[PDB]
Design a protein around this ligand. Structure first.
Ligand SMILES: [Zn+2]
Ligand SMILES: [Zn+2]
Ligand SMILES: [Zn+2]
Ligand SMILES: [Zn+2]
Ligand SMILES: [Zn+2]
Ligand SMILES: [Zn+2]
Lengths: 72, 72
C-alpha cells in the first residue's frame, strides 16, 4: 500500500527490526524513526528486509510506545 | 512492513492505482506489475502516492484476478 510515516527503503537498504515493539516478525521502521524513538532496553537489530515501508505510527504494526517523536 | 512483490517506490515515484482491483484507495502496484497484468477494462490511474510498497500478490490489498503474471 501507499499520522503514519511514509518512508520507504529498497532491496539493499537497511532498516530496524525491534522485537519489543513489533506486532509481527515482518514489521520494521526506518532508521530516522528508530533514532527518534526510545528502544534502549529493546531487542532490536539492523536488518536488510529486502525492501519495505516504515510501520512507525501504525498502531496495527507497531506498539505506540515505539513510535518516534514525530508520528503520534 | 518489509508470493508478494517486494518492490518499492519513493516520494517522487509513480505507481498505478486500479479502482477495479484495489481493496481500498490506499492500495497500489508498481509499474512493471501493472504492465504484466491485464487491466484494460479497469478504472486505473497513474499516481504519485508519496511513496509505498507494491500490493501485487497481497490478497488483503489486491484482487487475485489483478495479480501480474509473476506473482501467482
Ligand atoms: Zn519511518
Ligand atoms: Zn516515526
Ligand atoms: Zn522498540
Ligand atoms: Zn485492475
Ligand atoms: Zn510490483
Ligand atoms: Zn506483480
Amino acid at each position: 500500500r501507499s499520522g503514519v510515516c511514509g518512508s520507504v527503503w529498497g532491496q539493499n537498504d537497511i532498516a530496524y527490526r525491534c522485537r519489543t515493539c513489533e506486532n509481527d516478525p515482518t514489521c520494521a521502521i526506518c532508521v530516522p524513526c528508530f533514532q527518534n524513538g526510545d528502544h534502549n532496553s529493546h531487542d532490536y537489530s539492523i536488518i536488510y528486509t529486502g525492501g519495505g515501508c516504515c510501520d512507525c505510527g501504525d498502531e496495527t504494526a507497531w506498539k505506540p510506545d515505539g513510535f518516534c517523536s514525530n508520528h503520534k
